[PDB]
Amino acid sequence: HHWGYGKHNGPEHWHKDFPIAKGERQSPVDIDTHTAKYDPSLKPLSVSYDQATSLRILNNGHAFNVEFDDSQDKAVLKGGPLDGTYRLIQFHFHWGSLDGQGSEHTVDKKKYAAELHLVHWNTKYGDFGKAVQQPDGLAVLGIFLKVGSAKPGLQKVVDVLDSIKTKGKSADFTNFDPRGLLPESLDYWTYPGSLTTPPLLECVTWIVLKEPISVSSEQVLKFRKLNFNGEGEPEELMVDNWRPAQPLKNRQIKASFK
């Protein structure tokens, strides 16, 4: 009986196995745009993905991860609120059963259809497992998805999902360019938080872009055909794999823009 997103093992249950679920810097949160404060002194984001090397895509039973070679400085995030260099290790999404929900962060209580997380770890900690044990170990770039026009750069991801329908399936996924998933503007909000899935470690500097990307109804429909279960187990569609907004507590959200 492990954690998930169902009635009996979903977000309201997680605190029993992971008491940090009720901690002081949990994610996601609602971004109150009127209360967020512009922080001149915030630097422009630097997103350097030209040499990114994707390797594989994996259905891990909670989402699908597109994984990257992070054994060298090839795709890095720097600047913004960050000190030092953070290396891209994987991206994944959270999405809903309906276009009206699916994002983890909300904006003035608005839910988007999905949310992309580009996960990076601070290279001063040597690798990902060590980084998640540090308060400044990770930087996650969050990007909202709304339903409208297709995102051409997402299609290669959508088209491989049939090969990783169920938990534990993986497929080769080389030469995928994550630059094709970014909006025009890098204006962002930032705050200190956590992983949004167990173990919910408080190791993340969140950087959430203001500008959503648009994806087509057909693209998100294909996300919803994935399964949480393994092959040969009862089929349960992988939908609504999002944690709701958590209390902001003693935190201030900063904006890079006015």
Ligand X SMILES: CCc1cc2c(cc1OS(N)(=O)=O)CC[C@@H]1[C@@H]2CC[C@]2(C)C(=O)CC[C@@H]12
Question: Where along the sequence are the contacts to ligand X (CB under 6 A)?
Answer: 117, 119, 129, 132, 138, 140, 195-197, 199, 201
Provide the annotated active-site residues: 62
User: Which of the listed partners (Zn ion, ligand X, none) does 244 bind, with a CB threshold of 5 to 8 Å by partner kind?
Assistant: none
**Residue closer to Zn ion (CB basis): 143 or 186:** 143
**Residue closer to ligand X (CB basis): 99 or 104:** 104
In the chain, what is the greatest distance between 2 CA atoms, to the nearest angstrom?
54
Residue written as token pair 């949004």: 196
Query: Binding pattern to Zn ion, positions 103-122, x when CB under 5 A?
Result: --------------x-----
User: Which of the listed partners (ligand X, Zn ion, none) does 11 bind, with a CB threshold of 5 to 8 Å by partner kind?
Assistant: none
**Residue closer to Zn ion (CB basis): 39 or 240:** 240
**Is 92 annotated as a binding-site member?**
yes
Residue 167 touching Zn ion (CB under 5 A):
no
Q: H or E segment at 156?
A: helix 155-160
**Residue closer to ligand X (CB basis): 143 or 195:** 195
Spell out where 5-150 has E strands: 30-31, 37-38, 45-48, 54-59, 64-68, 76-79, 86-95, 106-107, 114-122, 138-147
User: Measuring CA to CA, how many Å separate 238 from each of 60, 69, 95, 167, 241?
Assistant: 11, 26, 9, 10, 7
User: Which of the listed partners (ligand X, Zn ion, none) does 186 bind, with a CB threshold of 5 to 8 Å by partner kind?
Assistant: none
To Zn ion, the closest distance from the beta carbon of 87 in angstroms equals 17
Q: In whole angstroms, what is the distance from residue 98 CA to residue 111 CA?
A: 11
Q: For Zn ion, which residue has the nearest CB?
A: 117
Contacts 24+ apart (CB under 8 A), 33-36: 33/107, 33/108, 33/255, 34/108, 35/253, 36/189, 36/252, 36/253, 36/254, 36/255
In the annotated binding site, the residues are 92, 94, 117, 196-197
Residues in contact with Zn ion by CB under 5 A are: 117
In the annotated binding site for Zn(2+), the residues are 92, 94, 117
